[PDB]
Structure 1
Amino acid sequence: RDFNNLTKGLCTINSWHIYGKDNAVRIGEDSDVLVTREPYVSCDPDECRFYALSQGTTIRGKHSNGTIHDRSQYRALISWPLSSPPTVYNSRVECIGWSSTSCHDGKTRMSICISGPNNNASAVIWYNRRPVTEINTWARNILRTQESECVCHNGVCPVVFTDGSATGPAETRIYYFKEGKILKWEPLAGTAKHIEECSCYGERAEITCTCRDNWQGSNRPVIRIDPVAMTHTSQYICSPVLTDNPRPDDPTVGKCNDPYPGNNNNGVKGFSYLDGVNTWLGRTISIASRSGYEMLKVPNALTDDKSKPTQGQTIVLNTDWSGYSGSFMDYWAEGECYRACFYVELIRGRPKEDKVWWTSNSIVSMCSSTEFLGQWDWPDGAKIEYFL
């Protein structure tokens, strides 16, 4: 009932423990589960929930044929209980649209969905389950945003949006919202060349976003934001451990303010926790496809351009599919420090498993632990052959 303030710092991460997993494609083989993608996880003061962009069909309905396409009029942002499937009967629709973000400021929740044709799209900002502000396309080519939660400090909650080419210079803006209303906005500044799909967190009154350059970097852009002063800066992560996909093999030396060359015009949403010696990077294991997934401890990855791993943890094995991944935290948990968490989207279907006509996913999520705990891998677990 008063706005949350990013007061604490992050706990030390010595390993990751399972937090939620829904087994959605298994259970969807014989239950009424909706076809999604682009999932994430966000918390309220009293419950943390799973989120995704619906495709408007169940996995076994006939209209599941064709769900590899990203934007259409039948998609919506939906949320559901932690670790249940997106069912037709248990899901809550937040807003209509084929790109989103959402965060709670302590008093209530802001949601933003985007819909439109490519050259005439528009975002409307929902605060306390009601429509308040709308924004229209500025550069007239697929206006999009984070696809994972935003972060708020005393009422102000910044959101990064890109409008323009995904294969050349684009127009990115950081908007500062409070209670649904635009306070100010700025264009992207600093050395990042291209921003797409930011995954963010905050600690000690600062917001950090690890984003995706689609144009030309296989190393990742980072935006640091100040919610009080309402300003931001951008860099690339210095470390040679490259975490975009597809990507060239790891070099010896990395790049701090320029894209690392080697693969152009493609990527994946990813994240990292950047906290000095306590820094952990997430990445696909295949350099060529979204398959496998690992967490790697690389001290001072952001600043040191020769930093190599110090400890690791396999989250998904290379023979299993992964996809998008992002950051969230439960800022309303009791304790001295923010515990860091992430989710990994596990895509099943087209394009890699071409023998069915649909695309869908399941979620796995994890949080940090100060113990050095043992590891297991967490694959989707459906057998595509049962759907034939």
Structure 2
Amino acid sequence: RDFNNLTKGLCTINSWHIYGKDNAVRIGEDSDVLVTREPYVSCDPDECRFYALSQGTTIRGKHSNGTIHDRSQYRALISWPLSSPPTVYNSRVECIGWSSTSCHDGKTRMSICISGPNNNASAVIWYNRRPVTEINTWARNILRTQESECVCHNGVCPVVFTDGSATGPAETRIYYFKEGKILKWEPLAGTAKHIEECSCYGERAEITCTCRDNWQGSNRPVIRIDPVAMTHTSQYICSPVLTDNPRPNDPTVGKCNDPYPGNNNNGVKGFSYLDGVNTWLGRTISIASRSGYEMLKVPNALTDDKSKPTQGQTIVLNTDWSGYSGSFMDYWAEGECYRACFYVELIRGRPKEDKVWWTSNSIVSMCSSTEFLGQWDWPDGAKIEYFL
């Protein structure tokens, strides 16, 4: 086993095919399914798995009462087989905490969990299923990371952390890890004004992250990382197709180097693939809530402040709940190119569905096709009434 290198480009995305779906909430109505949130997907050379933050209780368990809360001593990063539900019996604990990332470098998996109270959180970096490095809070205000997979290049796996305010300037850092050890770190540069929950992918020795500007921006900050030189910049998606939520209506001209205003102190984890004409953005259909999800082909979104969709695909109807979304690819597939993939978290329960005392989610996940495939919509599928 050698370290993986990002030596391919993206395949052409002409549409998106179904990849994985767990139906966790449907199934959890009558079986031992952990309450989760902040899910993602990550591949090993021999396996792709579902990841999420457990709440340390089953949906039907009485301890699910209160699981709207993000941070407790009862959370862990868990992983489980693709399209199975996160059950008590089939889930593997990666590490303990309430904020996480994980990736495989071609030889083994790095996993990072942050735990602790708001003013005294710490990150523990696991490599090869053993803790190797720890990082203490630097700003004493909820140290936090991506909540989706990191990408590695020749052993170097960059990871974006934020510590500080969610509603004002914070301190963001890029850690460059190898075999669990800190090669290097830098404070955020470029023109992104606030960074949270970066969704990352890698192609051609470059790692692109689309993040969440929780403070001011309804366009998304991007961080472009060079994992060999261990340097980066940042900016925003220029496109007027705004991809945060909530958000104002799409203008005609976006902003490249500043937050697009109209919505403050809020947002959602999201992602894009930024590849010239082969550029697709994800967003919730609603501008007001986390419902619906669509992919839009927006040629040159990153660099073109007037760019609009030339093609699209519904993933989740606007009458269905969505949530977080992020990027992963199977870097170990055979072929000339990396096939873009993504997941959408389908949040159920609180605060939108408050007849139940819990909040959980299921997952849907899709990869790109070079065909023009017909679309379906992919809702969670559970009847809340069944839990009353």
Tell me which interval the TM-score lies in, with the shorter structure as reference length: over 0.9
| Deviation per residue, 1:53-91 (Å, 9 max, x gap) | 000110001001010000010000000000000000000
Q: Distance in 2 between matches of 1:366 and 1:56?
A: 28
| Deviation per residue, 1:264-310 (Å, 9 max, x gap) | 00000000000000000000000000000000001000111100100
Aligned twin of 2:342: 342
| Deviation per residue, 1:197-237 (Å, 9 max, x gap) | 00000100000000000000000000000001000000000
Sequence identity percentage? 100
- Report the 3-state secondary structure (helix = DSSP H, G, I; strand = E; otherwise coil) of the residue aligned with 2:277: helix
Q: CA deviation at 1:93?
A: 0.4
Q: CA deviation at 1:316?
A: 0.1
| Deviation per residue, 1:150-184 (Å, 9 max, x gap) | 00000100000000000000000000000000011
Aligned twin of 2:25: 25
Q: Distance in 2 between matches of 1:75 and 1:103?
A: 19
Runs of 5+ unmatched residues, structure 1: none
Q: CA deviation at 1:8?
A: 0.5
Q: Distance in 2 between matches of 1:129 and 1:302?
A: 37
Q: Distance in 2 between matches of 1:113 and 1:307?
A: 38
Q: Distance in 2 between matches of 1:290 and 1:259?
A: 20
Runs of 5+ unmatched residues, structure 2: none
Aligned twin of 1:164: 164
Q: CA deviation at 1:325?
A: 0.3
- Report the 3-state secondary structure (helix = DSSP H, G, I; strand = E; otherwise coil) of the residue aligned with 1:26: helix
Q: CA deviation at 1:149?
A: 0.2
Q: Distance in 2 between matches of 1:57 and 1:124?
A: 23
| Deviation per residue, 1:319-338 (Å, 9 max, x gap) | 00000000000000000000
- Report the 3-state secondary structure (helix = DSSP H, G, I; strand = E; otherwise coil) of the residue aligned with 2:338: coil
Q: Distance in 1 between matches of 2:22 and 2:228?
A: 37
Q: Distance in 2 between matches of 1:75 and 1:305?
A: 41
| Deviation per residue, 1:220-258 (Å, 9 max, x gap) | 000000001000000000000000000000001111101
Q: Distance in 1 between matches of 2:61 and 2:308?
A: 47
Q: Distance in 2 between matches of 1:254 and 1:108?
A: 41
Aligned twin of 1:114: 114
The TM-score, its normalising length taken from structure 1, stands at: 1.00
Q: Distance in 1 between matches of 2:385 and 2:351?
A: 16
Q: What is the root-mean-square deviation in Å for CA atoms of aligned residues?
A: 0.4
The TM-score, its normalising length taken from structure 2, stands at: 1.00
Q: Distance in 1 between matches of 2:386 and 2:235?
A: 46
Q: Distance in 2 between matches of 1:159 and 1:181?
A: 12
Q: Distance in 2 between matches of 1:350 and 1:203?
A: 38
Q: CA deviation at 1:343?
A: 0.2
Q: CA deviation at 1:28?
A: 0.3
- Report the 3-state secondary structure (helix = DSSP H, G, I; strand = E; otherwise coil) of the residue aligned with 2:25: helix
Q: CA deviation at 1:348?
A: 0.3
